[PDB]
Design a protein around this ligand. Structure first.
Ligand code: PER
Ligand code: PER
Ligand code: PER
Ligand code: PER
Ligand code: PER
Ligand code: PER
Ligand code: PER
Ligand code: PER
Lengths: 243, 242, 243, 242, 242, 243, 244, 242
């Protein structure tokens, strides 16, 4: 009952107005060889959205370290976006550095399938993780009542880049997988002869011909991914509302 | 693009064949007062899928305690499903307790929008969080090459149930939000008079009329949620491969 | 081109979300015996729009005295509306007392034909004058770059109400028409026998059988309308920017 | 409902028969570098219509001063137009100098959306303000029972021409705006860096980054515009009926 | 009802994924001058299917000697196919040497009309005999509950090849037809003059002008076909379950 | 590129003209509790067709023994059918006892999908096995140049009936299956619990939970089915053309 | 209702399989300058059909003499056709010399509109008389229960051929018309001037300007046509059933 | 091509205007238990048509004897019909006793498929033989240039009536058939059993089981039918033009 773009599809070509100016997607980022996370929120000057913008802003350096840009999206105007950013900087002390798309009319929202059944008027909390070829790699749809876990978005992008670079699949809960820990998975053989050869080689740790794995990720890759989860799990030292 | 069910919609009505038998969704779970997490995986006898089933199985009691059940889905047959579960129990030592839908033909996958552009033949790693009214609450679409973080699925369900119960919205990264910690958010006023009254009352901690919050969650509820995230962050003491 | 509701049609039946709550148009006003002026503006936190809201707010008691309510409309959210009203109150010292419809998505805007070729995303400066039967009586379409003359909106509603009550048509530039001054026009005869009879009566001042008029508006009603125009022509002695 | 031309659109290309001859719109005016006001009226030999033609005629030189031509429109014939003009000149003592389109069958009226619900048979009192590029800049729809305020049409054209030449937006009620008087508005910044730069410049009087203004209009332009409103507000010295 | 390819039509052009790799049909075989038998089965890890694979495996050299390749098909994955082959080799001691198409989603099954009314989800037991020109020559549709007689598939291909090379039609039950034994049938005349001439020629053994036959097949070819049938009728000396 | 009825579907309801009279299918046989084999042939007075009718006629008592009726079908007239039967009895010494549908215009042929790319005008050599509930159980399509093996049709109907009666599946090449000989297969479990319960019972011979079998067929069932194959493989003692 | 080819139309172009082989209609006959009579019958090995084949066979020389070929048609196969012809030769002693189209599936039947409401499965007894230009000239539709009068088919072809060569219309019951006998009709004038000029010429015998005629047919042509009708009226001296 | 009514169909229900008045077909005749021959002709005051009308009128009594009415049809008016009848009676001395349908506009002609490729304007020479049940039994289509053989129309009606009453089929050229003379045919058996029974009964003269016949027609019926053909073949004693 709603159409969405799909993993493995190129991100829909569109021109969009942001509070940093007008840009073409995905080209703006593709043409710079950058991945991007496009996310949406229902409304400027609402509380869960504000908490998410602050969370993304605090993690901005972490996204930058991965060569990943951030871009928001709501049906509010650019004037709203700029006022809301002023409010956040003034009252919370956090500067939001990344652009937000202004989509009054919801033209962009409809193209991304962001209008669900909770609201006719405001987008859900969608997330599109897009690589440097402009291909959609992961999509999340959280609802208006539930803020995202932004560290899982960092883990997703990091693990996708790692997987691409090492030609490996990434196990559940990586880098803390219960079977293979920080190990990464060799894509399984797809022919009988390949399956036989793989075994006869003795090259990898293995549970069966279709489950081979090794540990090609650097300590830095592993501990940075693990850091995101540690941060997610840690009770904050000092809350921002206090000051 | 492709067609999907949407957040806020009733889960589409369907009869499905699982390796535990034939059931009707969402009625089977709604009838038991249960939420369910329906998730898909590309293929039995592939490694990332295997690690995810092991992670869900390990967390199964945690889901049960929340009144949530689990049901998998792939385009493999029930015979495949039963053999794969045999394999996992024998070789990894973990019994998978929950059903898996067998969807050869991809009838169910098409209804759910689980066939994306990565593969013509196998589903992506989709997740539908469905409440006890049978209403879809959250949807996640991970790709073939990346396993899920199952503790986040627990966090999502725990947070949604708390929000529903306490009549509150849940901030980014809860229960470790950097602005309000384990605080929960009062849904914002939608009229000028409501905004003025809310402020005049002095009832809540507030940054503005549209940003009020309090700390209604029990210590037990907060600690349960933090436990999910602590587990996610911790390197396992002993790996099951060993 | 684009589709609009038309003069003499009942105002399109619709439930709308305002910063005062949800209401049904035109019933909300019809059931109170009120006329209403529904006007649109392109965006909250934009300058021409702000000047118009201040102008309408200043004239609010004039509308209320006539039994006319005001209701605004833009594609911005209720949260934006409330924040904008706070800003106006705090910085200009003027409280905006009337509701504004929040139309993110442009559902109401499309229905009303308020999306023109200047902007794909924000409404024009439309005005619908709706009577207490819920019928559209006059429509104005001003562009983004040009603020309305709000005293002409008062003159329109005053003159329409007078014409309705007195069963009279209203000459150009009334109450200062160059031919008949504050005079009002008797609707012309539509048959030959009616035309001949009207002339035979000698009941009215007349230029021909189709042009008869009299002076049935009260001194108070004439002066009220004259006051609107004198205000329009008068330079404020003190400007609100000054304080 | 019904279709109409829209602000920002080029005025619909058409040949029209007037009581001055056949002309092509908007080309006839565009080729002369002139704006035009096209207005309609329900019917020749009706009283409100007559008062409006007299008002436009009285203001003809003011439109000419601005480089704006006038053209009327009704569903009556050219024969009716010429007879009605004779009548007005003889009985009111006013010559109507501008053309009126004759549109029996409402072909042109239908194209411009001038047939509304109050009459199936005669046009409403429409006004299209069209610039020298042929683009529709403002549209007004008054009803058959209420005559226009012609000085507001002058104010509209004057203010639009001023906005275009000075690259400024025009506040409500200009030149008597209650916030900034005869000031004109700088179109607001549309990016965060532009907003910051404008504030740092100190170039403009301002209430916020989105509300900057100055006073670039000449005294002549301001007083001209104010004079249209003064005239609107003035009780006539002598009535033409007398 | 449902749509199927037809006898005399070229086998539907398609790329297919097998547990040996990706191949294009019918080209892969045509380009080698080989016939192929494409057969389907409902599900890996089911018992009738397993018996059939072992039957084809036992006969694989007989097919090879005729210049006929074998290719299987079900809606299971390549991973299932490889695991199932492993199981058969380990438990039955038979290595399945030929590829099996993996058709999850049932794209190929639909194109070949292999989804019938007994199951929405798994194919029937279809057999397509395809010659070296890519043309479909015979089609069989057995049901889930009944295994094929693989020696009749050998008899069919052997008999079609003989009929093609010798320009003869093949009688019921050949090479053991009750009327003419191992005899082969001359295609009947289709005109009066042709019928008259055939009779006047006295060239063939004959029961009437439209029923003429001779014995052109070699002793080797006849004996080969008889051997298929003798094997079908013989109880195995040693059962593989033992 | 052609429509056919499908296994598991009720045989298409139709009234047909045979050389024995008009009957309704499948009702005619269902009402008697009989299975039937409906087979088609391209043309009367052609040689492969004649050999198949003689083969069916010779095996007629074997079909009768199983409670199975035979019915033929071609696009020829009833007159052709009767003449052809006369010819076969006179010239081959064999009486054809079962009816043949006359289908000029190919109405029935089209309903059964019996017109393939080999001939626009004459039916292929189709075989429909239909049970006593009127359901299609197996379909075979042989071409014009290749006669059927009628003993396989007998083995099919015998084995289907046997599987129905005993609630068993039938292995490849039964009763001479290479793995289990004359054994019959228990339909595999379709749930985990059913799979484990079957294994714990120790009720059946078994290679895995999904491969259990037993030997419930009588020696008479087994030896009758084997006899069809033995007959198929036997060189005829005397040829009918000689006689 | 049902669709049929029409008089004045070229016969529907088609390849047909006959018991003489595959030929193209009407080309096969047009190419030889021959007229043809295509006729249909419901079924081989049925009695009215058999009587009509024997009638056409007996009249085959008369048709050939006129440059007219015969071709039959039923929904039966070529094998049936051949066997039926064998039966007729053996039991009646008459060889059928002309081809019969085999139309199982009724493709040709449908195209010629030969399937009526009597039967869904077998053709009616249609007759198409087709000239050397391939044009349909006359169509007859007899029912299953009633055999044709074959001598009327000869009379039709003879008279149309005469009309064509002599530029004349042919009166009712020719050559025994009650008004003008073996006379043939001048096609009527279609304009007033042409009508007036015909009468002023005194060229023809005439009852009015629209009814002029003469006697341009040879004694041989007239007697040939009369012979067909005399044969139709005569009871055979010896019946073929007798000498089986 | 063009559409026509079919043998075995009820004659199209229609109201038609004749020179005798308005009648409903086929009901007018069905009501009387009569058969009818409806025939058409291209045009009144044309010569072939005139000869045919005279031939029908001469045979009127023969049709009446059989209980068969005649009705003509052309696209001419009733006024033309009456004038033409006047002409025929004055100049030929023959009264035309039966009605002719007047069909200007060709509404009936179109309905009966009587407009062929020879003429866009006038009907062919069609003949419908319709029984007392209103059912079309035979149709003939002669062209503009060739008059009908009216005695064959009598023979058709007589023979169809005889076949109906005696439950027999009628051989070619009856009552002068070259195989069986005035014999009539028993409709052939349609089952094997029926074929065998008929042969074993010895009831009928026969050539084979499918060719049985007898002689059930009275001498009166046979000689009457033969007389139609004798009349057709006879050179007229005196020509009416004389
Ligand atoms: O966002 O609440
Ligand atoms: O799944 O790897
Ligand atoms: O509004 O500027
Ligand atoms: O115009 O009144
Ligand atoms: O296959 O059971
Ligand atoms: O049948 O050959
Ligand atoms: O044919 O009877
Ligand atoms: O009719 O000539």
């Amino acid at each position: 009952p709603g159409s969405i773009p799909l993993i493995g599809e190129r991100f829909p070509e569109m021109e969009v107005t942001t509070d940093h100016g007008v840009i073409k997607l995905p080209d703006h980022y593709v043409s710079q060889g950058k991945w991007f996370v496009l996310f949406s929120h229902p409304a400027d000057f609402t509380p869960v959205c504000t908490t998410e913008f602050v969370s993304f802003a605090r993690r901005y350096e972490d996204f930058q370290r991965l060569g990943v840009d951030l871009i928001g999206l709501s049906v509010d105007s650019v004037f709203s976006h700029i006022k809301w950013k002023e409010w956040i900087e003034r009252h919370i002390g956090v500067r939001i550095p990344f652009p937000i798309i202004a989509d009054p009319q919801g033209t962009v929202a409809r193209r991304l399938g962001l209008l669900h059944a909770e609201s006719a008027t405001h987008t859900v909390r969608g997330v599109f993780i897009v690589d440097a070829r402009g291909v959609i790699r992961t999509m999340l749809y959280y609802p208006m009542e539930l803020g995202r876990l932004v560290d899982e978005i960092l883990r997703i992008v990091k693990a996708l880049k790692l997987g691409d670079s090492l030609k490996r699949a990434v196990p559940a809960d990586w880098p803390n997988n219960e079977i293979i820990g920080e190990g990464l998975i060799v894509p399984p053989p797809t022919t009988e002869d390949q399956a036989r050869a793989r075994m006869e080689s003795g090259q990898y740790r293995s549970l069966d011909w279709w489950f081979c794995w090794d540990t090609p990720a650097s300590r830095d890759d592993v501990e940075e991914a693990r850091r995101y989860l540690r941060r997610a799990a840690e009770k904050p030292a000092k809350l921002l509302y206090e000051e």
